[PDB]
Ligand binder design. Sequence first.
Ligand SMILES: *C(=O)[C@@H](NC(=O)/C(=C\CC)c1csc(N)n1)[C@@H]1NC(C(=O)OCOC(=O)C(C)(C)C)=C(COC(N)=O)CS1
Length: 446
Amino acid sequence: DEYITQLPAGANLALMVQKVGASAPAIDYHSQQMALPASTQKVITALAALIQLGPDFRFTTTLETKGNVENGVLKGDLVARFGADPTLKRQDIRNMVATLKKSGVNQIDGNVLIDTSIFASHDKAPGWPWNDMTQCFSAPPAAAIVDRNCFSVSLYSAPKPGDMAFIRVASYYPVTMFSQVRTLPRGSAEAQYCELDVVPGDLNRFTLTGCLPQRSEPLPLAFAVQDGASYAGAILKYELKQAGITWSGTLLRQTQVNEPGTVVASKQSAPLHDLLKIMLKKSDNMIADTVFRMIGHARFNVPGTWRAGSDAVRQILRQQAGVDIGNTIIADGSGLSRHNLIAPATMMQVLQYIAQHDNELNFISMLPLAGYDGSLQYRAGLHQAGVDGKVSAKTGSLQGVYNLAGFITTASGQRMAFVQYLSGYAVRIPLVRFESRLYKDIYQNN
Ligand SMILES: *C(=O)[C@@H](NC(=O)/C(=C\CC)c1csc(N)n1)[C@@H]1NC(C(=O)OCOC(=O)C(C)(C)C)=C(COC(N)=O)CS1
């Protein structure tokens, strides 16, 4: 009430603070008003994941044979069955292929199948901004992921202005780069409104367009792979050839559910509890979103889709956590989607459940701890409020958005849950002053 005055009038605050297990809140300010959660969405994802999949779930990738092996020759298909493992690396594919060879397969009399049947429909959630789709933080969290589905490129201006700027990319990235970038003389009138753009095409083609001012060093750029299956296929095909394995057929995608072949090689991710800790400490969208469609797959035994994920999380929260989210909209796991819409009061029910079951979930220890390595290592409001070491909370940050959801231990040692949904802060002083006062008050007055 007094605090709100610290913020620009352009800003929208919805805030709830409640003692763990209490029937009534200590602070309740527009707590039923629905807001964009951004990355605080990951709290709900983590909880739904632990309940549905459990802390010991591991993502799985396999090479399977369908057919008889005669004289080093597979009579049939090689199936590379991807499982949305966010942490799969090129070297892992190389290792599985080394294992395939070692098992006695030198030749495939058949097709190489890139099986993505674990998932179906689009690899991008509803409500994701189109313009972010080429950025690594928003890379499609496909069934087929290798080195996070992100690659990097160097863009060099041409020595003579008007000449085409040129692109260097490492041999080990199966992408196709084209440049239509005009190098501008220093001081060109064109430089103010001529954009430098990336335009993705089919089969992991990328075209760079527009203008680049003459510059002395290359411009480093990182892009998201748009077609994870094709990318993973191309890497597998490279690794097969290097290991001297030949095949007569072609690389085909397999999207339809099917019975597994004989598993000849496999890679499993770290256990889910480990991945959810990375996810919560780093706000890792890819772990959040692979987990999210995995939940739907697991709950309903269908290829995982965004809709299946949303229905499953809603159900898990209602039936296992006794939280009816009502009119909340859950669109993804990471909070990237602009369709995600939730009130502090609803997220409070989620936090209350977590605090009440924390000896079981080992959840709170996974959230960023204020003043320690993580997203809250130094958040000036919290530091100045004197609450380093006292707040465990998930951030949700965007231009003009400063969300915080989690727990604080007060001066008297009571634990309080809080949801701070604060947006349109297009107007780092008013925010600091608000949070310094607010968290200082909660800590010392409870
Ligand atoms: C959580 O909010 C995540 N990002 C988003 O949700 C975004 C939009 C959702 C509506 C978003 C749009 S554009 C963009 N880059 N993200 C993840 N959160 C963060 C992060 O912590 O926020 C950045 O600000 C901070 O670093 C502090 C919170 C001040 C510490 C991640 C870091 O950003 C990356 N790209 O450097 C991962 S994305």
